Design a protein around this ligand. Structure first.
Ligand SMILES: [Mg+2]
Ligand SMILES: [Mg+2]
Ligand SMILES: [Mg+2]
Ligand SMILES: [Mg+2]
Ligand SMILES: [Mg+2]
Ligand SMILES: [Mg+2]
Ligand SMILES: [Mg+2]
Ligand SMILES: [Mg+2]
Ligand SMILES: [Mg+2]
Ligand SMILES: [Mg+2]
Ligand SMILES: [Mg+2]
Ligand SMILES: [Mg+2]
Ligand SMILES: [Mg+2]
Ligand SMILES: [Mg+2]
Ligand SMILES: [Mg+2]
Ligand SMILES: [Mg+2]
Ligand SMILES: [Mg+2]
Ligand SMILES: [Mg+2]
Ligand SMILES: [Mg+2]
Ligand SMILES: [Mg+2]
Ligand SMILES: [Mg+2]
Ligand SMILES: [Mg+2]
Ligand SMILES: [Mg+2]
Ligand SMILES: [Mg+2]
Ligand SMILES: [Mg+2]
Ligand SMILES: [Mg+2]
Ligand SMILES: [Mg+2]
Ligand SMILES: [Mg+2]
Ligand SMILES: [Mg+2]
Ligand SMILES: [Mg+2]
Ligand SMILES: [Mg+2]
Ligand SMILES: [Mg+2]
Ligand SMILES: [Mg+2]
Ligand SMILES: [Mg+2]
Ligand SMILES: [Mg+2]
Ligand SMILES: [Mg+2]
Ligand SMILES: [Mg+2]
Ligand SMILES: [Mg+2]
Ligand SMILES: [Mg+2]
Ligand SMILES: [Mg+2]
Ligand SMILES: [Mg+2]
Ligand SMILES: [Mg+2]
Ligand SMILES: [Mg+2]
Ligand SMILES: [Mg+2]
Ligand SMILES: [Mg+2]
Ligand SMILES: [Mg+2]
Lengths: 70, 87, 116, 101
RNA sequence: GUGGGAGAGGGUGGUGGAAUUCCCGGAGUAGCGGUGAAAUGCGCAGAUACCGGGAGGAACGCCGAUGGCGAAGGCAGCCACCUGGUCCACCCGUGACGCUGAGGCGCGAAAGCGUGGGGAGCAAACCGGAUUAGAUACCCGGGUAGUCCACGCCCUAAACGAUGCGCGCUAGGUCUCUGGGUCUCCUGGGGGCCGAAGCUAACGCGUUAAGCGCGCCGCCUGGGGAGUACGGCCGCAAGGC
């Protein structure tokens, strides 16, 4: 149960059109992950948020998903 | 907006000697330029209020600066007023 | 005699009733059941037991159409929500997957004073 | 002038000629709004996250530009006007804030 | 002044998805809904549950905090444009240009008024179902104003930190948001918590004073009568000072 920034290279927290990096920041549902699981700074998180929502508008990232098992 | 460039144009215009950035002349200029932009704004966008408070405050500063530079050097004051189309 | 043998089972649970709907792979329903169908009436109608009976009715009714392999979608919450799934899993329909689809607003509509 | 990233997302079903067309008209827009072209990126076929316009998919192309900022809003109106342009976004270019650096 | 920043501060346009409701369509029976339990109610003119499409209004889940911004009211989808405040560094410019501020003028949550729109959900009034010694109130089912937008009024409040603004001074510890640094730390500006000296009737406050001081404004003088009467001013009114 490590953090997200933990496994990753350098990446652009500003880049919406890049999904492969972003999917890593989302839950099994469409939910942007709490800071706890992402391990960002307030600044870092605040930027990530906006960037996600931007790509969601562009249809590259889901607003919501369905929950398996259970 | 106001570019650094379209701004420093006005400082070069009002500077009393080279490099005069903060003289009373040049503060009243700069202020006035911002007051005008802000009013051209608040003519449309009439419902914007917090901006308009900004205007109130800016104009307040311009005045205190004038009222000074006038009690101090009436001649530089007359000149200033004339240049700026005011009072 | 629609001949389906594989398809969707929605389970709609509420704090009042519980309904189950069986359907074909693109969603057109086949049969269904509920707390009400199964004899129950009152409050009595939303208890886990009644959920059981309801799921089981709709499973037998599916059997009649030929149903075997079923992919489950729960929506809603309430006592004997999961009872219904544990009573599908006792049916003899073999359950592929269980997903949770409870809709949620992204905060659109005022609710009733009961909710605030 | 300022530097903007324009995105356009299209109906995938275009063949050569229709797509050629949309891009001739988009070039026409930019050229007619005072908007100069800095660079271009077409990632093309891409799988969407949710269906856009009943479609599983979209045709992406990205554009870095410089242009007059009183116009930009009207630019975007003109872009989205076409049927076949399913989505359009425009952002101001912001420099690349890093992370995990 | 130059350079660097954080931000639901504001105004205008556009735009996105979830959900509710309603319309159309397919499939499909006998119920659904709702409560402590019921009943009104809806459903064979085919409901509920499920799938596809459509229309419309309103509000933005996760991120979101013990967080940020604003003078206060207040302010959360994304994008663009217009715009306000504010922090830091450099020590560059002016040279006391400062503080407070009766009056004036502007802003001012919600409800409320006027004219015109819009109306999905909620919903004062109201029509009902039920509980009860009796609802007529709590619980359930409908529902109109209203809520939403434009313009113009209204000026209220637990408009609260129940703490007027500004400056200097007076241990520290700790958590935090945002800058700059030679970056375990230090230095500046916010937000919190313990606590030195001190203050306090106590409760408590304590570098975000309720401490030690100076300036200026507002306000108090037992409890009711009473925010009443009378008068004045404002207001279409309600009503306000
Ligand atoms: Mg029931
Ligand atoms: Mg089974
Ligand atoms: Mg109702
Ligand atoms: Mg600056
Ligand atoms: Mg804002
Ligand atoms: Mg139908
Ligand atoms: Mg009946
Ligand atoms: Mg009837
Ligand atoms: Mg629909
Ligand atoms: Mg309608
Ligand atoms: Mg939250
Ligand atoms: Mg806060
Ligand atoms: Mg700014
Ligand atoms: Mg000096
Ligand atoms: Mg000197
Ligand atoms: Mg003052
Ligand atoms: Mg007075
Ligand atoms: Mg006053
Ligand atoms: Mg109101
Ligand atoms: Mg009335
Ligand atoms: Mg009205
Ligand atoms: Mg009694
Ligand atoms: Mg009611
Ligand atoms: Mg008001
Ligand atoms: Mg309070
Ligand atoms: Mg408050
Ligand atoms: Mg005092
Ligand atoms: Mg720091
Ligand atoms: Mg640092
Ligand atoms: Mg501090
Ligand atoms: Mg502290
Ligand atoms: Mg304390
Ligand atoms: Mg002591
Ligand atoms: Mg004392
Ligand atoms: Mg004591
Ligand atoms: Mg004591
Ligand atoms: Mg004590
Ligand atoms: Mg003090
Ligand atoms: Mg005291
Ligand atoms: Mg008395
Ligand atoms: Mg008295
Ligand atoms: Mg009164
Ligand atoms: Mg009298
Ligand atoms: Mg009177
Ligand atoms: Mg009168
Ligand atoms: Mg009254």
């Amino acid at each position: 149960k490590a953090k997200v920034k933990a496994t990753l290279g350098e990446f652009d927290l500003r880049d919406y059109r890049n999904v492969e990096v972003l999917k890593r920041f989302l839950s099994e549902t469409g939910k942007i992950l709490p800071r706890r699981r992402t391990g960002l700074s307030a600044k870092e998180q605040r930027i990530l948020a906006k960037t996600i929502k931007r790509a969601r508008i562009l249809g590259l990232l889901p607003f919501t998903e369905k929950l398996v098992r259970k | 907006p106001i570019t650094k460039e379209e701004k420093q144009k006005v400082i070069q215009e009002f500077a009393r000697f080279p490099g005069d950035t903060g003289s009373t002349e040049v503060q009243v200029a700069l202020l006035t330029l911002r007051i005008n932009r802000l009013s051209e704004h608040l003519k449309v966008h009439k419902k914007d209020h917090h901006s308009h408070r900004g205007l109130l405050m800016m104009v307040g500063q311009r005045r205190r600066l004038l009222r000074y530079l006038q009690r101090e050097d009436p001649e530089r004051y007359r000149a200033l007023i004339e240049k700026l189309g005011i009072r | 005699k629609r001949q389906v043998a594989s398809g969707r089972a929605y389970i709609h649970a509420s704090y009042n009733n519980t309904i189950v709907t069986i359907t074909d792979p693109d969603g057109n329903p086949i049969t269904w059941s509920s707390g009400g169908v199964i004899g129950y009436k009152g409050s009595r109608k939303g208890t886990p037991y009644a959920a059981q009976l309801a799921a089981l009715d709709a499973a037998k009714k599916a059997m009649a159409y030929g149903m075997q392999s079923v992919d489950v979608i729960v929506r809603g919450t309430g006592a004997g929500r999961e009872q219904a799934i544990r009573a599908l899993q006792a049916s003899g329909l073999q359950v592929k997957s269980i997903v949770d689809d409870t809709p949620v607003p992204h905060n659109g509509c005022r609710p009733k004073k009961k909710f605030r | 002038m300022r530097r903007y990233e324009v995105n356009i997302v299209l109906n995938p079903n275009l063949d050569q000629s229709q797509l050629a067309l949309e891009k001739e008209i988009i070039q026409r827009a930019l050229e007619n709004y005072g908007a100069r072209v800095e660079k271009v990126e077409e990632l093309g076929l891409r799988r969407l996250a949710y269906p856009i316009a009943k479609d599983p998919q979209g045709y992406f192309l990205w554009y870095q530009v410089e242009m007059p900022e009183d116009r930009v809003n009207d630019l975007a109106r003109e872009l989205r006007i076409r049927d076949n342009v399913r989505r359009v976004m425009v952002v101001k270019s912001q420099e690349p804030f890093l992370a995990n650096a």
